[PDB]
Amino acid sequence: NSFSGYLKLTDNVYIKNADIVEEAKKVKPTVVVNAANVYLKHGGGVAGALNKATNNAMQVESDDYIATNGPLKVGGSCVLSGHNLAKHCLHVVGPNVNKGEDIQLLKSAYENFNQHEVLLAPLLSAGIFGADPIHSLRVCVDTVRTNVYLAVFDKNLYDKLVSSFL
C-alpha cells in the first residue's frame, strides 16, 4: 500500500511520527479513525483537525447523525464519510480520563478496529483525552488484529513509544 515510513511493531501494527490529517490527505486510505467524543463535537485534537480539513463537512454530517441516532457510547463507534480525506471515517470514542471515564473501555474502543481490514488511526484516549500513550499503544497491540497504521503527532513521544516497546 501507499503507507510510507512506518516502523513495524508487530505482525499487524505499524507506527510513524506524523499528522494524521497529512497522512490521510496523501494516502487517501479506505478508513481513517477519528478520536471522537460521544456527541461527535469535533473541536480539537484529531477530531478538530480532521474536521477542519473537511471544511466543516464532517461536523455537518455528524450533527445529522446525532440528531437521528443520539450520542455514541464510550467505547463505541460509527462509520461515516471520509469526505476528502478517506473513503470512510470510523469515529471511535475512547474513554476520557479527565472526565473519570473507565480506562478499561479503551479495549472496547480498539475492538471497533477489528471490523476493518486496514486503518489509519491515532492512539485512542491519548492526547487531550488524558490517558497514557504508552498504555494506549499496548492496548492497541493486544486488541487490534487487523492492520493498523498509527500516526503519532509528537516526535518526542513517538521516540519514547518506540524505545520502550519490546
Ligand X SMILES: O=S1(=O)CCC[C@@](O)(CNc2ncnc3[nH]ccc23)C1
Binding site for ligand X (CB under 6 A): 19-21, 45-46, 49, 122-123, 126-127, 133, 151-154, 157
Instruction: Kindly state the smallest distance separating residue 49's Cβ from ligand X, in Å.
Output: 4
In the list ligand X, Cl ion, none, the entry touching 93 (Cβ below 5 to 8 angstroms by class) is none
Identify what 21 binds: Cl ion, ligand X, none; CB under 5 to 8 Å per kind: ligand X
Could you say whether residue 127 binds Cl ion (CB under 5 A)?
yes
Give the C-alpha separation, 114 to 122, whole Å.
Answer: 15
- Single-letter amino acid code for the residue at 60: V
Q: Is 128 in the site for Cl ion (CB under 5 A)?
A: yes
CB 133 within 8 A of CB 103: no
**b/e code 117-151 from CB counts within 10 Å (16+ = b):** eebbbbbbbbbebbbebeebbebbbebbeebbbbb
Instruction: Give the residues lining the site for Cl ion (CB under 5 A).
Output: 45, 127-128
